[PDB]
Nucleic acid binder design. Structure first.
Ligand SMILES: [Mg+2]
Ligand SMILES: [Mg+2]
Ligand SMILES: [Mg+2]
Ligand SMILES: [Mg+2]
Ligand SMILES: [Mg+2]
Ligand SMILES: [Mg+2]
Ligand SMILES: [Mg+2]
Ligand SMILES: [Mg+2]
Ligand SMILES: [Mg+2]
Ligand SMILES: [Mg+2]
Ligand SMILES: [Mg+2]
Ligand SMILES: [Mg+2]
Ligand SMILES: [Mg+2]
Ligand SMILES: [Mg+2]
Ligand SMILES: [Mg+2]
Ligand SMILES: [Mg+2]
Ligand SMILES: [Mg+2]
Ligand SMILES: [Mg+2]
Ligand SMILES: [Mg+2]
Ligand SMILES: [Mg+2]
Ligand SMILES: [Mg+2]
Ligand SMILES: [Mg+2]
Ligand SMILES: [Mg+2]
Ligand SMILES: [Mg+2]
Ligand SMILES: [Mg+2]
Ligand SMILES: [Mg+2]
Ligand SMILES: [Mg+2]
Ligand SMILES: [Mg+2]
Ligand SMILES: [Mg+2]
Ligand SMILES: [Mg+2]
Ligand SMILES: [Mg+2]
Ligand SMILES: [Mg+2]
Ligand SMILES: [Mg+2]
Ligand SMILES: [Mg+2]
Ligand SMILES: [Mg+2]
Ligand SMILES: [Mg+2]
Ligand SMILES: [Mg+2]
Ligand SMILES: [Mg+2]
Ligand SMILES: [Mg+2]
Ligand SMILES: [Mg+2]
Lengths: 142, 206, 58, 98, 171
RNA sequence: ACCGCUGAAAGCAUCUAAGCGGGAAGCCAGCCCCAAGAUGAGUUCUCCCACUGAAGGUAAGACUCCCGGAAGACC
RNA sequence: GAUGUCGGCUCGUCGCAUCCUGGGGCUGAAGAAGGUCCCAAGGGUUGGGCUGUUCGCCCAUUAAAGCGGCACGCGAGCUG
RNA sequence: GCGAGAGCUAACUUCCGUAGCCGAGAGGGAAACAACCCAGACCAUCAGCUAAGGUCCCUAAAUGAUCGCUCAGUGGUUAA
């Protein structure tokens, strides 16, 4: 009875992270990935868009970009937790920090792993995906 | 930075100012500069270089084109040295001196599947006082319910040897420049006839 | 149903909450069952329903 | 577009024979009257009470008895297993009205 | 309370976002200040003013006012700390603009000034450090004092002009 | 941990409230070894070309098989 | 309708309330040698006599000869 | 939960009284979770309203409106 669509289209957009609080830029990108902005049409299908994050290096963070943000990874070996790259340090490779935030807000199933494909993070001002002319999102909601 | 390739000829005895000093002899034969790789073109700085000569009936057409691009009679072996940016070709003579420390890398003589007593120095069990596992065997492998498993990285019987091995800070006893020989104090990893790469000391030891 | 309806609603600048309110506050407007499909196929119509809800909330 | 608001019969716009929950009076030609809840004609939308004055004629087509299901139910470790049949009556009606 | 500035004659003070620039006898010196506070040139004499009587605004008011004072006075008037060494042996001299202290350590201790600082040796037993940035002159002289803190038992080590060093007991 | 420089809330004083320097066998990197199934599967050099009717003869190239090996249970 | 127990051996790995080594404050800290507290878990932490012993006492050395956890870690790994 | 004894004013302890739930109780909430919160499942529906509990993304629904508070990640582990 209820309408379900094609898969026909892919739409690209650049989000500028420059000076935005991370975490809020997080949920914005995570929803534009999930497909919640067009009608969700169907959960089965990733109708969501491709997103290009530029100036990922300059993301703002409150309270402590130090001290607070202790990112953590476990290695499989005894003593392999002590790997707490934390902090400002990961802004030595910024494209992962943003990329971690969005990935915690996509669902963990088989679609989410596939949705990871749709996030394209470039720490510098510029991006090379000029070919799929993306055009822009921006600041905040209503 | 500085490096060259060679074959491990053997190990003999030699006196220097009246003190016996075991030496490994290495043939550091001439090394053609085949491919030359810059960061500007290949994204990092290094130089490719070749060793044992190989008759051209034995050569792939693609490999013939690779050697022909530079103008080099084809060599059985090729390697790269980061940071080493020479000019011409790479003889033993010019780039080493008597008494440099130099790192010596080679491929360990390989010893097959070995038990924990050989591979990892385990104690092994008493050979008496009634006890099968009369030696050779690893003991316990875990704790019990609340570790639950055996550890990753654990130590147990395996393929010992046949590994890459560097030996730091070997001393250069003698260079017989014209014959392309080089004597080097102590024992390089490998086997006679094997490939070895001689290189600067990786550590700038004060 | 719901998850499509506010996606269209916000496409027109109001969320689900301040929409299905404003149809019910528009009282006799009551079509309710699967407004989803109206939002998903005719946007010329869902825009008019957005204008109706917003007029009712003023 | 047109669809029963399956609370009983009330609907939007466009004409095509469809199923519904039973309509009492039978045969055909019940001509059952329908009260608009929405309309899009010429893609000229009219809605809520203002449209509701609009008529929607529709004749009855056939009484029916849709596809069977089983009501089967189970609970654990308690011997509670019970099986029963069920089948819902319905009423085709062909849309026709303004 | 702390407000009025006594700006001299050779100075000029640029004004932007509260993070003002200065050029004068030894210009380009710049100090970074909060925007929520008011920065101002009333005209001849400088004046910094608090907005709110909240606990934190007054704190930044006092800090920014002392800092405009120190920075503006440091270009017109200069800076200098007169250190003296004490103890048997204990030598100091100069090589180029590098400080050579030779004081009871097996090695000599050399110190290379950061730029804008000037080491001086008016006496073989007197170090002197002139400069503009008060914070740099303070950190440089404090690095000289690190070389040996005066011991509790004899006062041996680096000092300022004439610190009333306290002295403990002994045997 | 601790040690300090400039310094306010208090015309004093204060390593702190903004900020700044020093400081460990520890942290990150540097040393050695593995590593693109890093499904995000990367880069560079060189070769064979554009056949016939998803296939089939073939290029470059490999494998099978033999004789061995400081490689190795078999692979 | 079975979760094999002390102790030894064999393998380890973790906590830190740190035995050694590293950095600091105070000392009734002159030096030297120490006391005590703070930070620190990288690595190291010996061989023997007696006893089933765990512990403990001794011998002889050590920078030091740490305390606990992991079914009082580990018997489809061994003893017994 | 409330009222008491025994207990250390311990215990997912034990023994009486009292109410409710589970026992034999599905459904929503409390991440997971017999007992706690809401609520007692005759069968069907691709219809609507609420309860507890919620409305940044996983994840249905205000990145709600107005006054303040805390710059501790307090929130998201006791006290003298
Ligand atoms: Mg072998
Ligand atoms: Mg033995
Ligand atoms: Mg487990
Ligand atoms: Mg609804
Ligand atoms: Mg069950
Ligand atoms: Mg039961
Ligand atoms: Mg002070
Ligand atoms: Mg600091
Ligand atoms: Mg430092
Ligand atoms: Mg270090
Ligand atoms: Mg060391
Ligand atoms: Mg692909
Ligand atoms: Mg084919
Ligand atoms: Mg061929
Ligand atoms: Mg059993
Ligand atoms: Mg059993
Ligand atoms: Mg027993
Ligand atoms: Mg501690
Ligand atoms: Mg000490
Ligand atoms: Mg002493
Ligand atoms: Mg002993
Ligand atoms: Mg232990
Ligand atoms: Mg016990
Ligand atoms: Mg045991
Ligand atoms: Mg066992
Ligand atoms: Mg017995
Ligand atoms: Mg009692
Ligand atoms: Mg009980
Ligand atoms: Mg029972
Ligand atoms: Mg009951
Ligand atoms: Mg229940
Ligand atoms: Mg439940
Ligand atoms: Mg649940
Ligand atoms: Mg819970
Ligand atoms: Mg329970
Ligand atoms: Mg139950
Ligand atoms: Mg409702
Ligand atoms: Mg409520
Ligand atoms: Mg939502
Ligand atoms: Mg809000």
């Amino acid at each position: 009875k209820t309408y379900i669509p094609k898969n026909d289209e892919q739409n690209w957009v650049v989000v500028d992270a420059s000076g935005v609080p991370l975490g809020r830029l997080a949920t914005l990108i995570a929803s534009r990935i999930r497909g919640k902005h067009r009608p969700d049409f169907t959960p089965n299908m990733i109708q969501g868009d491709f997103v290009v994050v530029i100036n990922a290096a300059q993301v703002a963070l409150t309270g402590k970009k130090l001290d607070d943000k202790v990112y953590t990874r476990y290695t499989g070996y005894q003593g392999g937790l002590k790997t707490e790259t934390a902090r400002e340090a990961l802004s030595k490779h910024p494209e992962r920090v943003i990329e971690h935030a969005v990935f915690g807000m996509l669902p963990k199933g088989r679609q989410g792993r596939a949705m990871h494909t749709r996030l394209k993070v470039y720490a510098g001002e510029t991006h090379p995906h000029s070919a799929q002319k993306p055009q822009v999102l921006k600041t905040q909601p209503l | 930075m500085k490096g060259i390739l060679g074959t491990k000829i053997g190990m003999t005895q030699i006196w220097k100012n009246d003190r016996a000093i075991p030496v490994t002899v290495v043939l550091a034969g001439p090394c053609p500069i085949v491919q030359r790789k810059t960061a500007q073109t290949d994204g990092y700085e290094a130089v490719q270089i070749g060793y044992a000569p190989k008759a051209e009936r034995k050569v792939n057409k693609p490999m013939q084109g690779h050697f022909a691009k530079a103008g080099v009679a084809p060599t059985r072996i090729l390697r790269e040295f980061r940071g080493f940016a020479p000019d011409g070709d790479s003889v033993n003579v010019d780039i080493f001196a008597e008494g440099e420390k130099i790192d010596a890398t080679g491929t360990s003589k390989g010893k097959g599947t070995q038990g924990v007593m050989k591979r990892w120095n385990f104690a092994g069990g008493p050979a008496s006082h009634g006890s099968k596992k009369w030696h050779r065997r690893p003991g316990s492998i875990g704790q019990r319910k609340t570790p639950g498993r055996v550890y990753k990285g654990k130590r147990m019987a395996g393929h010992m040897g046949m590994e890459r091995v560097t030996v730091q800070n070997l001393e250069v006893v003698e260079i017989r420049a014209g014959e392309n020989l080089i004597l080097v104090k102590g024992a390089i990893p490998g086997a006679n006839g094997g490939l070895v790469v001689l290189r600067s000391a990786a550590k700038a030891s004060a | 149903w719901i998850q499509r309806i506010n996606a269209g609603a916000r496409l027109h600048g109001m969320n689900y909450s301040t929409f299905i309110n404003g149809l019910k506050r528009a009282n006799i407007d009551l079509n309710r069952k699967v407004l989803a499909d109206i939002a998903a196929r005719e946007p010329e119509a869902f825009k008019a329903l957005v204008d109706a809800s917003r007029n009712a909330r003023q | 577009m047109f669809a029963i608001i399956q609370t009983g019969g009330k609907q939007y716009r466009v004409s095509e024979g469809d199923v519904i929950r039973v309509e009492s009076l039978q045969g055909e030609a019940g001509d059952k009257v329908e009260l608009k809840a929405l309309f899009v004609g010429g893609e000229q939308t009219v809605f809520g009470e203002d449209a509701g004055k609009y008529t929607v004629q529709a004749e009855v087509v056939e009484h029916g008895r849709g596809k069977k299901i089983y009501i089967r139910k189970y609970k654990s470790g308690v011997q509670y297993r019970r099986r029963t049949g069920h089948r819902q009556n319905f009423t085709a009606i062909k849309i026709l009205g303004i | 309370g702390k407000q009025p500035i006594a700006v001299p004659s050779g100075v000029t003070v640029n004004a932007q976002d509260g993070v003002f620039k200065v050029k004068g006898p030894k210009g380009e010196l710049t100090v970074p200040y909060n925007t929520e506070l008011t920065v101002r040139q009333d005209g001849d004499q400088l004046l910094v003013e608090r907005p709110s009587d909240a606990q934190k605004h007054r704190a930044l008011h006092g800090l920014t006012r002392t800092l405009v004072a120190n920075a503006v006075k440091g270009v017109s008037d200069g800076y200098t700390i007169n250190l003296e060494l004490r103890g048997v042996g204990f030598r100091a001299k100069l090589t180029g603009k590098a400080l050579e202290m030779n004081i009871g350590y097996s090695h000599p201790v050399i110190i290379e000034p950061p730029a804008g600082v000037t080491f001086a040796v008016p006496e073989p037993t007197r170090i002197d450090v002139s400069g503009i940035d008060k914070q740099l002159v303070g950190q440089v002289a404090a690095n000289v004092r690190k070389v040996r803190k005066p011991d509790a038992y004899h006062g041996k080590g680096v000092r300022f002009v004439g610190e009333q060093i306290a002295l403990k007991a002994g045997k």
